[PDB]
From a paper:
The exosome is a multiprotein complex that participates in the processing and degradation of RNA molecules. Several studies have linked exosomes to the quality control of messenger RNA (mRNA), the turnover of cytosolic messenger RNA (mRNA), and the processing of short noncoding RNA (sncRNA). Archaeal exosomes, unlike those of eukaryotes, contain only two RNase-PH-like subunits, Rrp41 and Rrp42. These subunits form a hexameric ring where Rrp41 and Rrp42 exist as heterodimers.
The crystal structure of TaciRrp41:42 with a phosphate ion was solved at 2.3 Å and belonged to the P213 space group. The TaciRrp41 and TaciRrp42 structural component revealed a heterodimeric complex structure of the exosome core at 2.3 Å. The overall exosome structure of Taci consists of nine subunits, three TaciRrp41 and TaciRrp42 heterodimers forming a hexameric ring structure and capped on one side by three subunits of TaciRrp4. Both TaciRrp41 and TaciRrp42 have an RNase-PH-like fold, with the characteristic of β-α-β layers of secondary structure elements. When the TaciRrp41 and TaciRrp42 subunits combine to form a complex, it was observed that the ninth β strands of each subunit aligned in an anti-parallel manner. Consequently, a total of eight β strands from each subunit were arranged in an anti-parallel structure. Also, four salt bridges were found to contribute to the stabilization of dimerization. The three salt bridges were located between helices surrounding the eight β strands (210E41–245K42, 104K41–107E42, 101E41–110R42), while the remaining one was formed between a TaciRrp42 β strand and a TaciRrp41 loop (207D41–225R42) (the superscripts 41 and 42 stand for TaciRrp41 and TaciRrp42, respectively). The central chamber within the ring contains three phosphorolytic active sites located at the interface between TaciRrp42 and TaciRrp41. Furthermore, many arginine residues from TaciRrp41 and TaciRrp42 are involved in forming a positively charged region around the inorganic phosphate. When superimposed on this structure, the position of the P1 phosphate coincided with the phosphate-binding site of S. sol.
Numbering used by the authors: 9 to 236, 304 to 538
Write the structure that this text describes.
């Protein structure tokens, strides 16, 4: 019925209680280093190769080594058989774990080198990315790769009003929030952080403290496993660039919006069509998001162009729309369990001048407000698509000692490390995403949360 009954969880744990965690180094013969980890229902093998010369020589870098973490899921690792090979989700995980490890590995010691980290999840519970990352640290040590700290992390979240630790798959699927965080323990700087769902500033700060406390026991399992006042433009730090929104830019779609954010220009388009719902969720419609980093937008684009970035943007934008519950996907049922409304949100980037995530969010929100779902084709009165909230994403980076928001492209590259905080008009936080190589202090993340709430308020009323 409920996930907690006696203040006791469906598997019997207290609120801040870890699942069983085991770690086992050296298990593999070929890998320079390796680690096997069991974390609740998670079984993950990690192998480490390198450092070695970078292949292909295209990707090579003369300053430092490149950390190529690859996250792969066995076909038999999830509920239903899944086709082998990467998908959008495993590439984003591979990117976000690569970036984290790039902060702890001493990449500068190995110019032109590559360090391969292979994360093979054999059976997945929830929190696989953090278990993989926690075991990668042990694998890298098992291989003798030099590091300046040992990355470790944990999840937390909200389940039936309670903040809990190390969520299960069911708590992830049906709970109110999920918050993966990895840190460098010596300093406590955050090298991985994401957040899905619905949470208050106070709840987010509590979940963080629970995670930070949890890593003390987890860092120990790792060790014993081895023992065996203005910007360059006029803008102030809280100031966005000029915006121009043009709704119904593509009248032949169901909804759309052209957005310019400074010199960053995207147009979002919404195509709503009848389709078959999920066999899991039969009384909910579908929202699928995609953001195209068109070669037209940047000179370097079609070098790389990177898809990693385009996939990351698409997920962070989708996450904000989804977790804000903007769409109200229950009102989009045509024939319960046979026909629902598929809401395609496609965003084409035509000009890139920084802050693609926020510009895309603004476009998405605006385009979803020309709602006009065509109900007249499957019966009907054409009705406006229910809009229940206004999620604003705010993206933030650190220039020197001062946090700014809406970075230009110039600011976007000067400092490694960005953080996106999406909020709704109730002052709840719905999604977060730490990006790029670089760490943030807890204070930075706290200032980020406050700044994003403040400037999102201003944003929402002005547009």
């Amino acid at each position: 019925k409920l996930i907690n009954e006696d203040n006791l969880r469906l598997d019997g744990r207290s609120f801040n209680e870890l699942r069983p965690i085991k770690i086992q180094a050296g298990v593999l013969n070929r890998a320079d280093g390796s680690a096997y980890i069991e974390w609740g229902g998670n079984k993950i093998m990690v192998g480490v190769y390198g450092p070695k010369e970078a292949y292909p020589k295209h990707s090579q870098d003369i300053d430092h080594a490149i950390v190529k973490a690859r996250y792969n899921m066995a076909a038999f690792s999830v509920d239903e058989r899944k086709r082998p090979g990467p998908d959008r989700r495993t590439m984003e995980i591979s990117k976000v774990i690569s970036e984290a490890l790039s902060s702890s590995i001493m990449i500068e010691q190995f110019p032109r080198a590559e360090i391969d980290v292979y994360i093979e999840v054999l059976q997945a519970d929830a929190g696989t990315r953090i278990a993989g990352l926690t075991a990668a640290t042990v694998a890298l040590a098992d291989a003798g790769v030099p590091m300046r700290d040992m990355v470790v992390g944990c999840t937390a979240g909200k389940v039936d009003g309670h903040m809990v630790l190390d969520l299960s798959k069911e708590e992830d699927n049906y709970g109110e929030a999920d918050i993966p965080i990895a840190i460098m323990p010596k300093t406590g700087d955050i090298v991985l952080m994401q957040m899905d769902g619905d949470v208050t500033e106070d709840e987010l700060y509590q979940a963080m403290d629970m995670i930070f406390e949890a890593t003390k026991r987890i860092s120990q399992i790792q060790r014993e496993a081895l023992l065996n006042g203005k910007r360059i433009d006029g803008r102030l730090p809280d100031e966005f660039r000029e915006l121009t929104i043009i709704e119904n830019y593509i009248p032949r779609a169901n909804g759309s919006a052209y957005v310019a954010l400074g010199n960053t220009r995207v147009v979002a388009g919404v195509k709503i069509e009848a389709g078959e719902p999920f066999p899991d969720t039969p009384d909910q419609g579908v929202l699928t998001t995609n953001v195209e980093l068109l070669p037209i937008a940047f000179p370097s684009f079609e070098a790389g162009p990177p898809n990693d970035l385009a996939i990351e943007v698409s997920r962070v934008v989708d996450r904000g729309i989804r977790e804000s519950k903007m769409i109200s996907p229950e009102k989009l049922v045509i024939e319960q369990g046979k026909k629902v409304w598929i809401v395609f949100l496609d965003i084409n980037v035509l000009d890139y001048d920084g802050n693609l995530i926020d510009a895309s969010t603004i476009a998405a929100v605006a385009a979803l407000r020309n709602a006009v779902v065509p109900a007249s084709k499957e019966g009907g009165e054409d009705f406006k698509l229910p809009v229940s909230s206004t999620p604003i994403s705010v993206t933030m980076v650190k220039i020197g000692d001062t946090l700014v928001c809406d970075p230009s492209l110039e600011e976007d590259q000067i400092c490694g490390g960005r953080i996106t905080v999406t909020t709704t008009e109730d002052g709840h936080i719905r999604a977060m995403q730490k990006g790029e190589i670089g760490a943030f202090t807890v204070e930075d993340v706290k200032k980020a949360v406050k700044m994003s709430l403040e400037v999102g308020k201003k944003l929402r009323e002005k547009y």
